Amino acid sequence: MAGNSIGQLFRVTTCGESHGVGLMAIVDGVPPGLALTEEDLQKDLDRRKPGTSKFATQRKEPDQVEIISGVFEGKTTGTPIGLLIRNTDQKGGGRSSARETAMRVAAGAIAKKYLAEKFGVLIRGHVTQIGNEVAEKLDWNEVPNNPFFCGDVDAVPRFEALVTSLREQGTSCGAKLEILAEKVPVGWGEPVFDRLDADIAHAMMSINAVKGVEIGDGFAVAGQFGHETRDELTSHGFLANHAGGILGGISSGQTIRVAIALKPTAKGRHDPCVGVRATPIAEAMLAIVLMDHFLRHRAQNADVVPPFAPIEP
Amino acid sequence: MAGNSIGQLFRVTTCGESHGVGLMAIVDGVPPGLALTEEDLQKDLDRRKPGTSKFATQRKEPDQVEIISGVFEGKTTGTPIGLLIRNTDQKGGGRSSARETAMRVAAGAIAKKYLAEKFGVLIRGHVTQIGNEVAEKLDWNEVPNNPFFCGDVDAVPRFEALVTSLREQGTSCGAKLEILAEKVPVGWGEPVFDRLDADIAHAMMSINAVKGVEIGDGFAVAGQFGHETRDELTSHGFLANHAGGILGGISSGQTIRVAIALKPTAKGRHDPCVGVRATPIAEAMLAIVLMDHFLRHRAQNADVVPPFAPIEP
């Protein structure tokens, strides 16, 4: 069955079998005035498989999302937004689990686009590891350039070789993704039980191969020592973002760092690392949580008193 | 300034400031007929101090939980159960935060008893690592013999040396705890968004200082390769809980394995590794989610029927 809803104020409620007739979502709480169209959503959808009709050799135009309510004349009305995908599962039956993820990613798209305009929040994820290959550096312009979402232009070949290797031998490997949210206003999160890190973990943990979630330095913290605050020299600065942007479960101000670990996954099926495909959904999940908490934080302000630096519309 | 509640069927709602008059919870959803008095709760509350006789230079009584409603003649009636702790702030000297943690432990104590009596579920935690010291073996008998919740009697010496140093040096260190849930029935959890692992993670992260949560093999999984090897005479059995007792977001029937990483914090009240005192609260939170998913699982179906299982009173 299903626990098919997520969010208090930004709410996504869904349904649909991968083999069923179609897939649906109702998304509540998105304020009126947001330019929004189907294309905005597909573009994130189609990001899940980074091919055009290019990617799978003879693949069709993919199944397309349709906005059924909530948008008037290109803009959000501020009523509940309905999404539909009709499954053109072309007329033992298998199942492709990109259909099971669609509604999340279409909804996250809505929360991304809203948070980018309003705040310039930018939510982006990259695979740091596949099995025994690690990326060692980050270049945002590189992650779209290779089919692993890898920020390290020199590991891409090494990742590529490991994928080529596994394919040969009827195996598959684990993955670790990092997702970041930047330009996130301070103060979001709801201790005790709805800390921003908690909802994040909750949300990420809805993705299927996930075995862990961490925030900031995450697990390394186990081995660390409390050597961060009392004495400085003249130059130094302790913005290492050890907390990964959440402290006491409310946003810092700093970028938000979350990592997750996806496990290995069971004609030639080119399996081998389905985990990299989780990036756009991991990005989706984070957006959905931040939007929810945006709305909660606003609902708890009689009205605003900044603070806001030289302004950066 | 709170999101002060957790659960859908087993629901726990709280309030109380540490220097407020008192602390309260209202716990919803416990079936009638569980044997319950204040003592079943203090035992758990008083476990935040592995030694209560074992204290630095003086100890108060301490502070006693009172059950306000939902029990008759020693038994849950099935009505919401009210809990209160009146702060004897005493009307400085010694100040502790054990207070923001009490209603959680008290309510976990309840979930825990019900699970223990009904399904014989066993939820215990142990500290696997403090700073640079790691414990190797687990002997449940050891766990309450030391003040570290440590299951390895050869690590106790080392943990003691480490902590004794750090306190005189004035340094704090992080910890890593493992919490286990044994004899948990198969079936529990609610995908897509309320998977058991998602709600575990969510809950673990309400504990301050947690920077990571992992299920089963957890972060090891990024570096792993996949198959159920193999077809030959010796090959590894599926029940090595790689999954830590959750599959596709629902309990497997295997033991539930959860690890969390807690970061270092910052007269003789110096907390070098407060992380170890989090063990009872991680037990409570795991009990609270389990209890919740039990009821939700009951609610889902009209008729329970085999497997025969172990449902042991």
Report CA-CA distances (Å) from A133 to A136, A159, B48, B227. 10, 6, 42, 19
B107: exposed, middle or buried (C-beta count within 10 Å: 0-12, 13-18, 19+)? buried
Cα nearest neighbour of B216 on chain A = A211
Q: What radius of gyration do chain A's Cα atoms show? A: 20
β-pair type (A81-86, A65-69): antiparallel
Residue closest to A288 by CA, chosen among A129, A153, A108, A68: A108
SS3 state at A226: coil
Q: Do A263 and B224 touch (CB under 8 A)?
A: yes
Q: Do A248 and B208 touch (CB under 8 A)?
A: yes
A265 is in an annotated binding site: yes
B304: exposed, middle or buried (C-beta count within 10 Å: 0-12, 13-18, 19+)? exposed
* Paired tokens of B112: 């825990």
In which element (H, E) is residue A179 found? strand A175-182
Question: According to the 3-state scheme, what is the secondary structure of chain B?
Answer: CCECEECCCCEEEEECCCCCCEEEEEEECCCCCCECCHHHHHHHHHCCCCCCCCCCCCCCCCCCEEECCCEECCEECCCCEEEEEECCCCCCCCCCCCCCCHHHHHHHHHHHHHHHHHHCCEEEEEEEEECCEECCCCCCCCCCCCCCCCCCCCCHHHHHHHHHHHHHHCCCECEEEEEEEECCCCCCCECECECHHHHHHHHHCCCCCEEEEEECCHHHHHHCECCCCCCCCCCCCCCCCCCCCEECCEECCCCEEEEEEECCCCCCCCCCCHHHHHHHHHHHHHHHHHHHHHHHHHHHCCCCCCCCCCCCC
Contacts of A236 (CB under 8 A, 6+ apart): none
Backbone region of residue A241 per phi and psi (left: phi > 0; alpha: psi in -120 to 50; beta: other values): left
- Cα separation, A15 vs A26, in Å, equals 9
Cβ-Cβ pairs closer than 8 A, A with B, add up to 213
β-pair type (A22-28, A11-16): antiparallel
CATH classification at residue B160? 3.60.150.10
- Cα separation, A297 vs A8, in Å, equals 12
Contacts of A240 (CB under 8 A, 6+ apart): none
Residue closest to B194 by CA, chosen among B3, B1, B10: B10
Residue closest to A130 by CA, chosen among B230, B246, B226: B226
Give the amino acid at A266. A
A248 is in an annotated binding site: yes
Burial B14-27 (b: 16+ CB within 10 A, else e): bebeeeeebbbbbb
CB A216 within 8 A of CB A257: yes
Sign of the CA dihedral running A205, A189, A253, A118: positive
What angle in degrees, to the nearest 10, is found between the helix axes of B279-300 and B102-119? 50
Contacts of A251 (CB under 8 A, 6+ apart): A184, A185, A186, A187, A188, A189, A196, A245, A293
B204 to chain A, closest Cα gap in Å: 8
The coordinates were experimentally obtained by X-ray
- Cα separation, B174 vs A222, in Å, equals 5
Q: Which residue segment(s) compose the domain that A128 sits in?
A: 1-313
* Number of independent structural domains in chain A: 1
Resolution in A: 2.5
Residue closest to A251 by CA, chosen among A285, A206, A296: A296
- Give B-chain residues touching A206 at CB under 8 angstroms: 191-193, 195, 198, 249
* Paired tokens of B7: 């659960």
Q: Do A219 and B176 touch (CB under 8 A)?
A: yes
Q: Do B197 and A210 touch (CB under 8 A)?
A: yes
What angle in degrees, to the nearest 10, is found between the helix axes of B102-119 and B38-46? 120
Contacts of A224 (CB under 8 A, 6+ apart): A217, B131, B173, B174, B263, B264
CB B165 within 8 A of CB B151: no
CB B64 within 8 A of CB B47: no
- Cα separation, B148 vs B153, in Å, equals 10
- Cα separation, B130 vs B150, in Å, equals 10
- Cα separation, A10 vs A13, in Å, equals 10
CB B119 within 8 A of CB B312: yes
SS3 state at A119: helix
